[PDB]
């Protein structure tokens, strides 16, 4: 099974480790992002067939899909909370905390995806196969071998569908319902990327260099 496989490759629980203003909040998220960026990359290589792609294509996918995969981590962690965003198990933002630190509009955007996933009652197994699917479905304009990337997409999609066609056969077309959240996923990731590039430009906030490198690709 690819799901059991992709599942135990996921990192273990993350903990925030950060003048208590807006500039200290952004830094905590920016370094939580950079720390998980590092872990996506470790995790990506466990996706079957991902490492058999040419390195340029592995980078093209990651460069397109990285924020989508982070957002899906925040979403998964946030499912049990009452309109809270858990960037980490340590670090759980609400509306007022968000608004003060300038993150309100981003906060509302992610919460919309959170509330959609709460109603779908998405499981850890589905988050994992969906993270993988967002990676292979990134739509990078810089892929050299579209056919190999499509094969991966077909594989991850098969997995998601065959996982659903048994573990959750009580609910029909539950696969498609999860796929139908992907546009909002990409949309929300677009808002996060612009906001975080907006604090990149401002310069008042420091960013570990892997995070910065991903942000300028976008």
């Amino acid at each position: 099974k690819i799901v059991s496989h992709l599942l135990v490759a996921e990192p273990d629980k993350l903990y925030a480790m950060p003048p208590e203003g807006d500039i200290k909040a952004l830094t905590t998220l920016c370094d939580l992002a950079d720390r998980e960026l590092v872990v996506i990359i470790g995790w990506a290589k466990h996706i079957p067939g991902f490492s058999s792609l040419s390195l340029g294509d592995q980078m093209s996918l990651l460069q397109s899909a990285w924020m989508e995969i982070l957002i899906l981590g925040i979403v998964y962690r946030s499912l049990p909370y009452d309109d809270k965003l858990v960037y980490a198990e340590d670090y759980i933002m609400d509306e007022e905390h968000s608004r003060l630190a300038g993150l309100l509009e981003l906060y509302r955007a992610i919460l919309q995806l959170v509330r959609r996933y709460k109603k779908l009652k998405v499981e850890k197994e589905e988050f994992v196969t969906l993270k993988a699917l967002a990676l292979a479905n990134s739509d990078s304009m810089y892929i050299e071998d579209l056919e190999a990337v499509q094969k991966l997409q077909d594989l991850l999609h098969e997995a998601l569908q065959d996982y659903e066609l048994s573990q959750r056969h009580e609910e029909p077309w539950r696969t498609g319902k999860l796929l139908l959240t992907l546009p909002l996923l990409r949309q929300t990731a677009a808002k996060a990327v612009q906001h975080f590039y907006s604090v990149k430009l401002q310069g008042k906030v420091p960013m570990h260099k892997l995070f910065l490198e991903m942000l300028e690709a976008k």
């Binding site: 990359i41 990651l62 991903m214």
Partner: peptide, 10 residues
């Protein structure tokens, strides 16, 4: 030269 390729081939 990129951090990404560093982390991708570690």
């Amino acid at each position: 030269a990129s951090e990404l390729l560093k982390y991708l081939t570690t």
